[PDB]
Amino acid sequence: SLAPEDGSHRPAAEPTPPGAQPTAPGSLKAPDTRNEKLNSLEDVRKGSENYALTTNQGVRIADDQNSLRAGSRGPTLLEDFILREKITHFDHERIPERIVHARGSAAHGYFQPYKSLSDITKADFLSDPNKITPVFVRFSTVQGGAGSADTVRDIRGFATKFYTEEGIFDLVGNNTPIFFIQDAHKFPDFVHAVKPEPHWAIPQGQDAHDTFWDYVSLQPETLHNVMWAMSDRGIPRSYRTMEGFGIHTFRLINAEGKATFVRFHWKPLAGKASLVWDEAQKLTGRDPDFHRRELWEAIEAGDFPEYELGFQLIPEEDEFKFDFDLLDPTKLIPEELVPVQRVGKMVLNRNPDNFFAENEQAAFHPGHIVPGLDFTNDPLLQGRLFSYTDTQISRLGGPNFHEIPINRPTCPYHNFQRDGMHRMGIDTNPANYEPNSINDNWPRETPPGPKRGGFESYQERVEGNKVRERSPSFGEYYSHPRLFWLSQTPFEQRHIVDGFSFELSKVVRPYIRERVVDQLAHIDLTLAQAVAKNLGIELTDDQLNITPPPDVNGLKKDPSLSLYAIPDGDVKGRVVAILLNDEVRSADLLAILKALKAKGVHAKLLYSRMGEVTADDGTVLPIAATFAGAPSLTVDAVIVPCGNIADIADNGDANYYLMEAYKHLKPIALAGDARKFKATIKIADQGEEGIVEADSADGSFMDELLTLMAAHRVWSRIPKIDKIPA
Amino acid sequence: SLAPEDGSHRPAAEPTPPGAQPTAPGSLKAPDTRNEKLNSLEDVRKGSENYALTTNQGVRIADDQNSLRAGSRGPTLLEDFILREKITHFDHERIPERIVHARGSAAHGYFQPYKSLSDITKADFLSDPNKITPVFVRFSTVQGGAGSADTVRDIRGFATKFYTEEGIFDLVGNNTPIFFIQDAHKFPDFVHAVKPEPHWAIPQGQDAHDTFWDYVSLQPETLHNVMWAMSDRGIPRSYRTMEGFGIHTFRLINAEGKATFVRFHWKPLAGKASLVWDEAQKLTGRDPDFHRRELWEAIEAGDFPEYELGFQLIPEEDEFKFDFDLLDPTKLIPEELVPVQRVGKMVLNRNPDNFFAENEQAAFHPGHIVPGLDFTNDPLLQGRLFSYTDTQISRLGGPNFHEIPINRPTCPYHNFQRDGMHRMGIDTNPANYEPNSINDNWPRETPPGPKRGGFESYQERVEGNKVRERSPSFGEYYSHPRLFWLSQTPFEQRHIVDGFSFELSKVVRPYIRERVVDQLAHIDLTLAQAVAKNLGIELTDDQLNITPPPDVNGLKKDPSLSLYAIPDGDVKGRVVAILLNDEVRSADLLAILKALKAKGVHAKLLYSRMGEVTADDGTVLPIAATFAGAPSLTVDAVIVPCGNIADIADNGDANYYLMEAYKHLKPIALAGDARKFKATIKIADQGEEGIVEADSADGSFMDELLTLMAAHRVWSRIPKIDKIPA
C-alpha cells in the first residue's frame, strides 16, 4: 500500500473547478454521466483495482522489477518471456499519426434537435426532438504533429461523429466557412506547402515560412481562407469559443424525394473569443497543451461545451442566384443573404477514459452519411470521399477500423464482408455472398423509404464531357476576401494586418513577400498598404490603381463574419488570476471570490512560492501556483486584492504579470493599496477604461470587473500598448 | 425468398454422418455444445437472419447489385462510398500466412485430468479431476502454404491452447517425438532447405528435392526425424489417428519447489493409422482438403477426436542416467525406459464458426506457460521462446494479438501495457506504470505460491562461459535412427525404404543421393542396401563395413515406436464404400448397414451417376457420389452387395475402384454375384486373406469385414500388389 492514508491521491467523483483536484479518466470522474455509446463501451472498459498484475496471457507476475538472469549480476536470459512480452508491447505502441489534424482533443456528448425536420430531410437523428444521439467530437489544429502545441495560428478542425439509429454520420468541419483550395487534386500540394519543409522539417505548427506563402502567391484561390487564418480566427481562446462549419454545400433529401441544398454550422453557446498573437505564441511555450487542458477541465467542472447546429438552406431552383458558385468551397454564403436556421443543441459532457484508445484511434470521414443526406459535386468534397477510407488502412492497420470500439456503430451492422487484419466479429452466417439461397439471402437489401429505408443517391442530372477542368464560375478570388476584410472591426483589421506582417517577415525570399503584397492589393488597398509599410515595401502606382473586386450580391459587409462586432460574451468558465500578498485583506477576498463564483468564473490564487499565506483575519489561503508558474497568458483577467502590497511590489514576476496581462488587453482590477501597481503599467491618476480601481473590492468593483470580462478584451487600450516594454 | 420451400438448404442441428447434411458453422450445427471459452466468444458472434444488409457504419443498403454511375451506361462515380467500402474490405482481406505450419485445421474442445497432480505440479489446470479446461487445437503440416494439400508426406503439428484459470498454456507439439535439428539458430537454414527452392518456388508440400536432401546429407543430426518422416508416420490417415509429442524436456514444479523433468505425449484413443504413399499422393489431387474435411465431419458426426495426455517423468537426479542428453530434441526417451503416465483426456467436440477469425488468426506459442511448468536449456526450445511472440507482430498486425477473440484468456488479465495497433481494451486505471501511488499500486504483483501465485522461474544453477558451442553430449546421430528402424514391422521397414527411394529419385544431383545413402549405411546396412538398390547405387566395402551404432541403454527395439506392432485399431468413424447396381439385393444392404451402424462405421453409397436407384424389393436408394467422384482413396474398405452385377461388371470405373482399393491394402467384401469381380483383382477361387466373400451378406460376412477393418490394412497382400496395373 503506497497510496497516502488520507485518500488524497484520488479525485472526487463530482464536478470540481480547474485545479481543485487531479484530473482523471471520465468514467471515474463522472461515473453517472451516461449515453447509449458510453454504455456500449462497457464490454471493453478494463478496471485495475484489486486485480493481480499479469501477462497478456493472464499469467500472474511475481517480480515486475527485474529481468531473469543467470546470477544477480549475470546476463539476461532469452527465456524471460515476461520481460519480452512487456518490452514487445512497449516497442510497438505507436501508430501513424493522422496526415493532417494530427493534434486534437476529444470528448463524448449528446445531440438533440429542437423540432422534427421531417419536412426537409428523412435523416432519423433529426426526426424527433426527443431523440437523443450520442456524439464523439474531436477538435484539432491542421499542420502540426500530434505532439505540437495547441495555441498556434492555424485553422482548427471540428469533427463530430453522430451515432445514429440508421448509421454513423460524421460532420467533419473546420472553424472557418471556406477552405484554401477548390479541387481535391491540389490537396497534397497545398498541404505539403504548409507542412514543415522537406529538407529540414521546419517549421512545426506555423504557416510562417517560404513554401506556404509561395503557394498562396501562386494560387489566389487560397486568399479567402488565408484572410481568416491571419485574423484572430486563427488563434481561438478555447475550442468552446470558436464557430464550426461543414464548408461544403451538401443536400438534405426528404421522404418525398425533394433535395434542398444545405451548409452546416455550429454556433458556440459560450460565444466567440480569440487570443492575441503575442499571447498565443508565448502560450505555445508556457503551455503547449492549453486547449486540450481547458476542454478537459471545463468538462470536469461542468462547464460543458455547448454548440447549436444550424443550417443555411437554399432551394434547388436558387442554385444559380448568387455571384459565386454554391459548389465552390473557397466561397462563403453570407448570413445576410441566407440566414442560419437553428436545428438543435450538442453538449459535450464527458471526457474519454484513455486518450489513445478513444481519441487517437477515432476515425471520422465526411463520406459517412445516412439516408436523408447526400453530397454535391463540390470538387473538394468529391475527392475527400476517396481519402478518409483509404488513409485508415495504414493509420488504423486495416479494413476493420470500424470494429475499434470508439468507431463502432450503436445501431445494427450486418453484411457479407469478411476477414482483414484484426478481425473481431465472428460471423455465423452460412453465406458470405449475395444473392444466396443457403441463408435465405439474409442479411437483405432494404428499399428506400421514409424511415429505416436503404440509402439511394439523389438522381441529379449529370451532363458534360469527361474533362479535367475547373469551372469558370470558380475563377473569382478577391471579392470574398474583401467582404471578410470590410466586415471586421478596426482592431480586427489591425490584427489581420499584423498577422500578415508577422508571417511574411519570416519568409526569407523577399520576392515572395512582394508577390503576396500584390495579391493583397487586389483585395483592399488599405490592407495592402498597411502590410507593405511593415515590410518596408512601397506599392507601385499600378498597384495603387487596381480596382477593388465587386461587392458580393450587393453586400459591403456582413457583421456575422466578425468575432466581436456583435457582443456575444459569456463569462462562465473563464478564469481570473488573484495576486496574493502575505497579509491579504480578507474582506476583499470574500467579496472577489463569491462574485466570481456567482457567475461561474474560476479563480487561481497566485503567490511567489507554493504553500499557504495568512489573511489579515487569520484565514489560511492555499496557493495554486506561483506568478511564473501560472502566467497571465493562462487567465482572462487579473485582480490584485488589498493588503501588504510592499510584499510583492518589488517582485519582478508580480509586476511583469500585470504588464503582460495589460499588453494582451486583459481587464485588471486593483483594490486599496494594490493601486500602487498603476505605476508599473503607467495608468493616469484619474484612471482609464479597462482598469477597475477602488478603495476596496466592495460595492460595484466586482460588477465593473465582470462587465469588462463579458466584453473579453479592452480593445481601446491598443494604442497605449506599443510603448509598453513587455 | 430464395431458399427452397422444403427447407433442405439448412442442415439439421443434430449429429449426422459424413455426407448426410451440408456442413455448417459450429454454433449453428451444435448450438448446445458449450464450454467457458465458447461461451465467452458470444460477445463477438454475429448472426444474420432477419437483419438488413448495411455498410460497416450501419447504413442500410438499397441496391447491392450496382455501382453509382452517371447514366446506366456511364462512368462510376467517386462518391460511391458503398462500393468503395465493400471493395476496400475485400482488397485487404488477406493477412500473412504462418512462416511454417501455414496449412492447418482446428476445433474447440475440453480437457480434464484423471486425478490431481499436485504432488508433481502446482499447474491449476492439473489440480483436480473436476477441473474442465476449454481447449482450441490446430493440427497442421509444416512445409506447404495455407492453400497446399493435406495428405502430403510431412511432419504434422499438433498445437493445443489450454484456457486455464491461471493463464493460457500452449502445448505446441508435432506428431513425432523429436525434431530435425538441435539448435534454434539453424531453424531458418533447415526450413529454407525444406521449403520451395528460392529461384522458382518449387516444390509445394514435398521434401522430395535437392536442397532438403543436401541439408540432411550434411547435417546427420536430422537423420532421426527424417527416418520418421520417411515412414508411414509421415502420411497419417487422420489427425485423429496420429500421436502428438511436445518433443522437448520441460519441467513440472510443485508447491514445494521441486522440479521434475517431463516430456509430453498425446495418445489417440482412435488408435494409430496411416495411409500408404501411392494413396496419399493421389489423394492430394482427388481431395487436397481430406484431413480438414475428415476432422470437421468427425466432429459433426459425434466421432469426437479424443486424446489422452501422457507424461514421461524423470527425477532431477536422473538427468545423466541415459546414453543420450535429455536436452537434445533429436533424441526420444524410449517408453521401455520411462513409461508414459496417462494424466487426462482431451475431447474436440465443436468446429469453429469462421475459419479465418478463429483458425487463421489463432496464435499458439510454447513460451505461453503457467505456474507449475517451466523450461529447460534445450537449445531448440530456448530459441523458439523468442520466435513465437516476434512473428505475431507482422502476422497479426501488432502487439494486441491477445485481444483477437480466439486468443483471449478466459481468466483475468490486467497490466500497465497500453496502446499498439487496434487496441481494443479501454483502460481506466489512472496509472499506467508501477510502482504507483495514484491507484494504490494496482494491479499488484503476487508472490509465487501453491495456488494463484505469481510466476517465478525454477532457480536452476548456471555455470559456464559465454559460448556458441554445441554440447559434446549432442554429438551422436545414428543410434536413435537405428532404434526406430529396428522397432518397425517388416512392412513398415519396406515403406521406409520406399519413402527414401522415391524421395531420393527426385533429387536431380546424383552425388546428393549418394551422400544420403552413405548416412544410411551408418544407421543400418539392410536399410542402406535396399535404398541403394532402388537408386542403382552399389555400396563400397568401406560402407559394407561401418560398425552399427550402439543400442540405446541396452534396447534393441521398442514396439511403442511402431504404428502397427501392437494392435490398437478402432473402427468407429471409419467409412466404407458400397458399390451399388440398378437392382441391389436389399437383404444384403440391410445386413451391411445394420452391422456398420452397430460399430459406428459410416457408409457411402456409390453408383455410375447421381440420383437414386431402386432395390429388388423397391427400396429407393439415394446415391451419395459416383465411382469417380468419391474414389476408393477416401474410404477404409469397400463392400459390393449382390444384385444385377452385369449393370456394373463392365464399368471401368467400378473395376478400377476395386483395383485401387486392393493395391492400397484395403479390405474388400464381395456378396453373391459380386464375386465375379474377383477376376479384376486376380483372386484364386479358394479365396485370399483380406477378401471377404460369401453367398450373401449374412452376419458372419460382416464380422469378418469388420475384423479386417480393426486391423486397418491387409499387410500380407503386399507381395501380390506388384502385378496389379493400378
Next chain:
Amino acid sequence: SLAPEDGSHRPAAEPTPPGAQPTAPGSLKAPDTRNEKLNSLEDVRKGSENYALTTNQGVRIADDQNSLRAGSRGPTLLEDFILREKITHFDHERIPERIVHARGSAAHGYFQPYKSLSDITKADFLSDPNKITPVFVRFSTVQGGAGSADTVRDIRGFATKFYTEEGIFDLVGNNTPIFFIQDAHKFPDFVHAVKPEPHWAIPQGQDAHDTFWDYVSLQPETLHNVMWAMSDRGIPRSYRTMEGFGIHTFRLINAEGKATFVRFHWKPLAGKASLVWDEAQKLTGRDPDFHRRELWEAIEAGDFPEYE
C-alpha cells in the same frame, strides 16, 4: 517560368552565415562535400530540374490542377487514376514515430581516430589514424512527439551510426553519463510515468507532472539522472554544446583476446553551454525548432559540430 528573373529563389552553393540565404538540401548546398556513405546514396537520390511531372508509373501528367469530372461542374470519376495515385500516396505518408526520442535532428559527417588503438581493441574503425569512417548522427529529446519543441527540459539523445569496413557500429548514447533506471524490465514503467498521462495525453515535452514525480519518489534509483535533468544540463544551448556518453560499461577486445572495460564519451569541441529555464521555456513557444535550425545552419555556415 515562376522563378524570379534575378535568381534570388536559389541559395548559393557555398558556406553562408545563418539567415544569409534560404536553407537547402545538403547535396545542393554543399555538392562537393562527400564521403563513402554520402556517395553510396547516389543510387536513390532524385533531382527534378528539367524533368516532366509524372505518375509513379512514369506517365506524364498534363493537368495537375484538376480532378477528372463529368462536365466542369460535375462529379469526380473513379477512373481518375492520377488523382487517386496522388491522394493514395499522400494518405499513407506517415509512419509510426519512435516510441522514445521521436523528436530529433540529424546530420552526416566523418570520424577518424588520433592513433591506432590495436593494443586495446581490434575494431577496424579504431585501427588506423588515416582511415576515415563516415557517420550519421541524430540528436534528440526523449519524451516529446516528433512535432514537439526542441528547448524543453529533458535528457538529450546523441546516437552515432559508424559505417565501418567490418559492419555498422551504432553508439546510442545520451547527454548525461547515467540513466534513470537499473533494469530494462522497468523501462516501460519509467517511460509511461514520464510520457503524457494516459487519460488526457498531457503534458507534452515535460516531466513537470504528477506521474513522473510519483515514480521518482517511489524509485530512488532515479534520483541521480533526475539531478542531471533538473540542472541546466536539461536545457542545452545547442546540440553542439553538450556532452555525450554511452552510459553502460562495454568491453574492448584486442587481437590477443584481452577484455578491457570501457565507457564512451563525446566531448564537444565548441564547449559546454546551456540556456537558463525562463529562456528555454519561452523559446519553445518563440521557436520550437531552435536546435534543429541551429544545427542545420551551423553546418551550412561551415561551423561544423565537432566532438572528441
Next chain:
Amino acid sequence: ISRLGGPNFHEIPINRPTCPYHNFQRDGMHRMGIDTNPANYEPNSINDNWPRETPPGPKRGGFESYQERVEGNKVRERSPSFG
C-alpha cells in the same frame, strides 16, 4: 497498400518504371527515393516549378482523357442492354 506494405510499391525493383519518373509525392513506409527538389508542391517558384506538367501531343505528351460525352442521372442501375 496492405499486400506490399504501403504506397511506395512502385519502388520495389520489379515494379520500377525504366523511364523517368519525378513528382511531388513524398514519404510513406519503406521510402527508397531521396528527393533533392527544394519544392514538394506545385505550383512553386523555389524550383522554377520543376518537375513540370506537359501538354498532350503526338509523342512524349502529358496524359489527357478522351472527352467522352456523359449524360444521365446519378443511378445505381444495370443498363438494360446488359440484360
